[PDB]
Design a binder for these strands. Structure first.
Ligand SMILES: [K+]
Ligand SMILES: [K+]
Ligand SMILES: [K+]
Ligand SMILES: [K+]
Ligand SMILES: [K+]
Ligand SMILES: [K+]
Ligand SMILES: [K+]
Ligand SMILES: [Mg+2]
Ligand SMILES: [Mg+2]
Ligand SMILES: [Mg+2]
Ligand SMILES: [Mg+2]
Ligand SMILES: [Mg+2]
Ligand SMILES: [Mg+2]
Ligand SMILES: [Mg+2]
Ligand SMILES: [Mg+2]
Ligand SMILES: [Mg+2]
Ligand SMILES: [Mg+2]
Ligand SMILES: [Mg+2]
Ligand SMILES: [Mg+2]
Ligand SMILES: [Mg+2]
Ligand SMILES: [Mg+2]
Ligand SMILES: [Mg+2]
Ligand SMILES: [Mg+2]
Ligand SMILES: [Mg+2]
Ligand SMILES: [Mg+2]
Ligand SMILES: [Mg+2]
Ligand SMILES: [Mg+2]
Ligand SMILES: [Mg+2]
Ligand SMILES: [Mg+2]
Ligand SMILES: [Mg+2]
Ligand SMILES: [Mg+2]
Ligand SMILES: [Mg+2]
Ligand SMILES: [Mg+2]
Ligand SMILES: [Mg+2]
Ligand SMILES: [Mg+2]
Ligand SMILES: [Mg+2]
Ligand SMILES: [Mg+2]
Ligand SMILES: [Mg+2]
Ligand SMILES: [Mg+2]
Ligand SMILES: [Mg+2]
Ligand SMILES: [Mg+2]
Ligand SMILES: [Mg+2]
Ligand SMILES: [Mg+2]
Ligand SMILES: [Mg+2]
Ligand SMILES: [Mg+2]
Ligand SMILES: [Mg+2]
Ligand SMILES: [Mg+2]
Ligand SMILES: [Mg+2]
Ligand SMILES: [Mg+2]
Ligand SMILES: [Mg+2]
Ligand SMILES: [Mg+2]
Ligand SMILES: [Mg+2]
Ligand SMILES: [Mg+2]
Ligand SMILES: [Mg+2]
Ligand SMILES: [Mg+2]
Ligand SMILES: [Mg+2]
Ligand SMILES: [Mg+2]
Ligand SMILES: [Mg+2]
Ligand SMILES: [Mg+2]
Ligand SMILES: [Mg+2]
Ligand SMILES: [Mg+2]
Ligand SMILES: [Mg+2]
Ligand SMILES: [Mg+2]
Ligand SMILES: [Mg+2]
Ligand SMILES: [Mg+2]
Ligand SMILES: [Mg+2]
Ligand SMILES: [Mg+2]
Ligand SMILES: [Mg+2]
Ligand SMILES: [Mg+2]
Ligand SMILES: [Mg+2]
Ligand SMILES: [Mg+2]
Ligand SMILES: [Mg+2]
Ligand SMILES: [Mg+2]
Ligand SMILES: [Mg+2]
Ligand SMILES: [Mg+2]
Ligand SMILES: [Mg+2]
Ligand SMILES: [Mg+2]
Ligand SMILES: [Zn+2]
Lengths: 208, 150, 235, 138
RNA sequence: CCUGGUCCACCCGUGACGCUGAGGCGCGAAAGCGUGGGGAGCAAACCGGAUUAGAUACCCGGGUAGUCCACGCCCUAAACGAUGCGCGCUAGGUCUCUGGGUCUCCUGGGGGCCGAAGCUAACGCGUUAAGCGCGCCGCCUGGGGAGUACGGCCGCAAGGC
RNA sequence: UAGCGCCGGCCAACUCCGUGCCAGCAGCCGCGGUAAUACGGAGGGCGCGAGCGUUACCCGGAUUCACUGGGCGUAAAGGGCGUGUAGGCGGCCUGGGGCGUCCCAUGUGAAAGACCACGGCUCAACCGUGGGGGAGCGUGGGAUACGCUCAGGCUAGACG
């Protein structure tokens, strides 16, 4: 499914500016920079005080639509995190960040997460030399996420890695722009992520 | 400095020659999330006045909660009327698992991980009073050894 | 401060009935169906009570004297008309402490009417108001005679009969105000923070206790005052 | 007669402390005395002593209370907030060493009768033996 | 006249002989049944008089079974404190019945009222607990259908469990 | 290739028209008799997505058969009362036994499954390897506070 369709309507409905197109969510064209109200005929009307279930559902939907992961994989990852020892929320965020498509996005190979998903699915991304075409692939600490030697001549990768010159990467990632590769150093901490999501709200949403 | 959240708002009715006349009641919890909570039930002919009065009464009735790493020091069990509240400490990463009323009361108290259960009557007023008395009957190890000095 | 042997008539309590079991610790024995107070525990508690009174007085605190038993009214009305501790004499109005702001508004109206009768505005707005406000000021002075001195909540209260003045005691408990009281056998000592186990019906007991207490108050602030002119109220 | 003398003693202590009594007399027995040893050791009571009533031996338990509190209800806080018999006649409760409960997550005690005497939850756990779960006190 | 229970005082005797109690067994208001007797008053059914729109009622005049007795059945109830029994523990005040005692009063048993703590959804309970505990038995699991049907046991029947 | 359900409250999502206790909807409360956010259609929205709904069944919530964990004055519930059989329960002290109870050691607890770790199919599902377990029962040895039993003693219960 992948929800494929309009994206900045989620930028509007969630009330927080999301980055689903990469660019144009920074440019004054996101429609969140100019239309912050939710979509539909009844978007500009006075909003009623939402229920607690409303708040938790909206927060979980925000966190899910940020990564573009379906409800099935999302709930499975949450249950997997809850089975493990440690804080459920931080482990859940580390699991979501460990996805191959999200790592490709974080490493600057793609401008958006869905563009990264298409780059992975089409075999333009390799892991430790071997080609991997699975967005749900879990990257372990130490894996070298590289670009296919046959794909390093493509225009989009040239553009993205030409813009990545001088740009800093996450504290848990390393980037080699000349070799067009990177390394997943460690699992990111909660302080490492600046996501506008309260993970405890999602934990309480699935606690029901 | 003080967070304020309403539990429930209801409209009661008294009978008078001519018809029924309404009066609004509202529960309000106030907390600094540092270990202090307060519960208040305010009644007024209109809703905003009732909410303000409940906030005043809540700020007037405070309870110091002995938090121990975001959780409770020991499991408690309080019967208020027919409503029973059961509280139990939890390890971090668990979250607050409670009904709406106790979740709000404990969140405003500064609790982050706890396990609760409502038994008997599910009345929100009595459940709130039972949770308040539960937080009031909390003792620390320091308090325990203080009571057994002799 | 020299009331060791001069306690003549304080040991007499109430009858066998109309007592409180919690007072049994402060009772010596029963002579002719009348509870008699233990003479030793009387001064035993008097030490601590008068020590608290001295500590609170030398710090500049205010004590509210409450008396309505019709046997201590004329005594409290002058023992508190000494060093400026206020008093309540005719009857204790519900909410004088918990609803202190509204009673202070009543006091504002009292001094307002006192200012109107001090200004030449008495003649305007003719005799109808000149009688209405006259009676209003009369009853305001009747009820708020000593209470008008309280600018804020008192730091302690003094009671003559905590059973007769139970409402004032309860209001003091609600506001965490210390409760000093001359308790008898018909009262609950647990509610009293500083107990004085004496008699509440006799006039000499009340006169002795309150006179020595106000003397201790003025002694804590220096300038020992002459003996109180309450002896003539023996009648 | 008394069906459960131990529960009778526990209820005597409960009813005594609930009215803030000075001491309470319970019909004396070596078992009750060995329990009162644990009580006075853990600070729930000021102590106990053997006494004699008109013809028969009793045990005076001297109760313990907190400081007098402020505001309404100045009655002090109870030192024995809760004392409940567990292994009653007709349903006797025996637990292994790995089945000894932790009362109030440590703030309470559990009195056990084991083959090595009358112990507490932590005492029996340190000794490594279980037995009859007499009562829980906290 | 025969006879049961119970309370107190003395501290005399036995030495845990105790508590509860599925079944079983017996007692069990009134009404009702059988046999015999009795039958004043009352009185189902019934005979009438009124009232009423009608009055198979209330009101009025009569009146049988019955009410009564002996013997044998029947096993029901708002059989009610709508609160099973026993023991211990937990403020008092007042009224009363009944003992004992240094007989203003104390102490023991019983019957009421008000109330400490406490309990209760509340009303209320509160040393005669509905409080705090322990032991044992009985019973409850939404309302109607229904205390009906079936089966069994009991009963002369009505009918009961 | 994108579909399916929902948008009165529980429960996330609102307007227009049609209809007029009609036609219908409905898990529960309930909605419709002229201006329906509940019927029917449309627009819009919410939720999932190669699925979405429905029905049936099981556990859950349900502390609503209450061992953990409920009750019986007035809400369902104390037997009409007693006598008493079996059964359940048993005041204080000493000793013997060691049945209940407890402890140690040991055997048993197949594999698969479950849990944890690593690894193999590009991931996963799936699978492999290793690790950790565990009540119960058998055996040997030990403990005796409590419950039990036996023997004796005491008088506070009980009876005389
Ligand atoms: K290719
Ligand atoms: K309670
Ligand atoms: K005949
Ligand atoms: K009945
Ligand atoms: K007599
Ligand atoms: K039609
Ligand atoms: K519709
Ligand atoms: Mg977790
Ligand atoms: Mg977990
Ligand atoms: Mg505290
Ligand atoms: Mg209850
Ligand atoms: Mg319920
Ligand atoms: Mg319900
Ligand atoms: Mg075992
Ligand atoms: Mg430690
Ligand atoms: Mg003898
Ligand atoms: Mg003998
Ligand atoms: Mg019997
Ligand atoms: Mg029977
Ligand atoms: Mg009969
Ligand atoms: Mg008859
Ligand atoms: Mg006959
Ligand atoms: Mg005949
Ligand atoms: Mg006649
Ligand atoms: Mg007729
Ligand atoms: Mg008529
Ligand atoms: Mg006619
Ligand atoms: Mg007649
Ligand atoms: Mg005749
Ligand atoms: Mg006949
Ligand atoms: Mg009756
Ligand atoms: Mg009955
Ligand atoms: Mg009933
Ligand atoms: Mg009874
Ligand atoms: Mg009596
Ligand atoms: Mg009463
Ligand atoms: Mg009370
Ligand atoms: Mg009341
Ligand atoms: Mg009782
Ligand atoms: Mg039924
Ligand atoms: Mg039914
Ligand atoms: Mg029926
Ligand atoms: Mg019948
Ligand atoms: Mg039949
Ligand atoms: Mg037959
Ligand atoms: Mg018939
Ligand atoms: Mg018939
Ligand atoms: Mg029948
Ligand atoms: Mg809604
Ligand atoms: Mg529909
Ligand atoms: Mg269904
Ligand atoms: Mg129309
Ligand atoms: Mg319309
Ligand atoms: Mg509609
Ligand atoms: Mg649509
Ligand atoms: Mg399906
Ligand atoms: Mg179900
Ligand atoms: Mg269940
Ligand atoms: Mg449950
Ligand atoms: Mg059911
Ligand atoms: Mg149970
Ligand atoms: Mg129930
Ligand atoms: Mg009965
Ligand atoms: Mg037997
Ligand atoms: Mg027997
Ligand atoms: Mg024994
Ligand atoms: Mg036996
Ligand atoms: Mg032995
Ligand atoms: Mg053995
Ligand atoms: Mg296995
Ligand atoms: Mg399982
Ligand atoms: Mg692998
Ligand atoms: Mg093992
Ligand atoms: Mg063995
Ligand atoms: Mg031995
Ligand atoms: Mg013997
Ligand atoms: Mg005798
Ligand atoms: Zn955008």
């Amino acid at each position: 499914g992948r929800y494929i369709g309009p994206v900045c309507r989620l930028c509007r409905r969630e009330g927080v500016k999301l980055y689903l197109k990469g660019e144009r969510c920074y440019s004054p064209k996101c429609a969140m920079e100019r239309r912050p109200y939710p979509p539909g005929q009844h978007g500009q009307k006075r909003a009623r005080r939402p229920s607690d279930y409303a708040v938790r559902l909206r927060e979980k939907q925000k966190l899910r639509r940020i990564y573009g992961i379906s409800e099935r994989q999302f709930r499975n990852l949450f249950e997997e995190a809850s089975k493990k020892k440690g804080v459920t929320g931080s482990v859940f965020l580390g699991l979501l960040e460990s996805r191959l498509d999200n790592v490709v996005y974080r490493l600057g190979f793609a401008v958006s997460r869905r563009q990264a998903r298409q780059l992975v699915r089409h075999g333009h991304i390799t892991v430790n030399g071997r080609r991997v075409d699975l967005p749900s692939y879990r990257v372990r600490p130490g894996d070298e996420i590289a670009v296919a030697e046959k794909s390093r001549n493509l225009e989009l990768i040239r553009q993205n890695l030409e813009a990545m010159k001088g740009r800093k990467v996450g504290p848990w990632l390393s980037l080699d722009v000349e070799g067009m590769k990177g390394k997943f150093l460690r699992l990111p901490d909660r302080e490492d992520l600046a996501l506008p999501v309260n993970e405890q709200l999602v934990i309480e949403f699935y606690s029901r | 400095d003080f967070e304020e959240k309403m539990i429930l708002i209801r409209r009661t009715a008294r009978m008078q020659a001519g018809g029924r006349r309404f009066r609004f009641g509202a529960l309000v919890v106030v907390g600094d999330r540092q270990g202090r909570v307060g519960l208040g039930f305010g009644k007024a002919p209109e809703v905003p006045l009732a909410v303000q009065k409940a906030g005043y009464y809540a700020r007037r009735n405070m309870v110091e909660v002995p938090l121990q790493n975001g959780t409770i020091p020991h499991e408690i069990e309080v019967e208020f009327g027919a409503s029973k509240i059961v509280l139990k400490p939890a390890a971090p990463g668990t979250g607050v698992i409670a009904g709406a009323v106790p979740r709000a009361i404990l969140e405003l108290a500064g609790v982050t991980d706890i396990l609760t259960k409502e038994l008997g009557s599910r009345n929100p007023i009595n459940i709130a009073y039972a949770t308040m008395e539960a937080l009031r009957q909390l003792r620390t190890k320091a308090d325990v050894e203080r009571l057994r000095k002799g | 401060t020299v009331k060791e042997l001069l306690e003549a008539g304080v040991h007499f309590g109430h009858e066998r009935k109309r007592w409180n079991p919690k007072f049994a610790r402060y009772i010596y024995a029963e002579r002719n169906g009348i509870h008699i107070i233990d003479l030793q525990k009387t001064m035993e508690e008097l030490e601590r009570t008068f020590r608290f009174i001295e500590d609170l007085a030398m710090r500049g605190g205010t004590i509210l004297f409450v008396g309505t038993k019709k046997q201590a009214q004329d005594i409290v009305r002058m023992e508190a008309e000494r060093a400026g501790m206020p008093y309540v004499n005719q009857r204790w109005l519900g909410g004088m402490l918990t609803n202190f702001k509204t009673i202070s508004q009543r006091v504002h109206r009292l001094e307002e009417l006192e200012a109107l009768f001090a200004s030449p505005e008495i003649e305007e707005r003719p005799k109808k108001e000149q009688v209405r406000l006259k009676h209003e000021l009369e009853r305001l002075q009747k009820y708020l005679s000593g209470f008008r001195l309280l600018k804020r909540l008192p730091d302690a209260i003094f009671v003559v009969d905590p059973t007769k003045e139970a409402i004032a005691v309860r209001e003091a408990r609600k506001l965490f105000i210390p409760v000093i009281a001359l308790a008898d056998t018909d009262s609950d000592p647990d509610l009293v923070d500083y107990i004085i186990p004496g008699n509440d019906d006799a006039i000499r007991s009340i006169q002795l206790i309150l006179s020595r207490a106000v003397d201790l108050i003025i002694q804590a602030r220096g300038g020992v005052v002459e003996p109180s002119p309450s002896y003539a109220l023996v009648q | 007669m008394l069906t459960d003398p131990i529960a009778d003693m526990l209820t005597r202590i409960r009813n005594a402390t609930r009215v803030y009594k000075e001491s309470t007399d319970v019909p004396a027995s070596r078992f009750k005395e060995e329990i009162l040893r644990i009580l006075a050791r853990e600070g729930f009571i000021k102590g106990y002593e053997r006494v004699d009533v008109d013809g028969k031996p009793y045990l005076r338990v001297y109760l313990k209370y907190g400081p007098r509190r402020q505001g309404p209800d100045p009655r002090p806080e109870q030192v024995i907030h809760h004392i409940r018999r567990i292994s009653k006649p007709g349903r006797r409760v025996y637990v292994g060493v790995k089945e000894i409960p932790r009362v109030r997550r440590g703030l309470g005690i559990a009195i056990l009768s084991t083959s090595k005497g009358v112990l507490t939850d932590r005492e029996a756990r340190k000794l490594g033996v279980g037995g009859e779960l007499i009562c829980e006190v906290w």
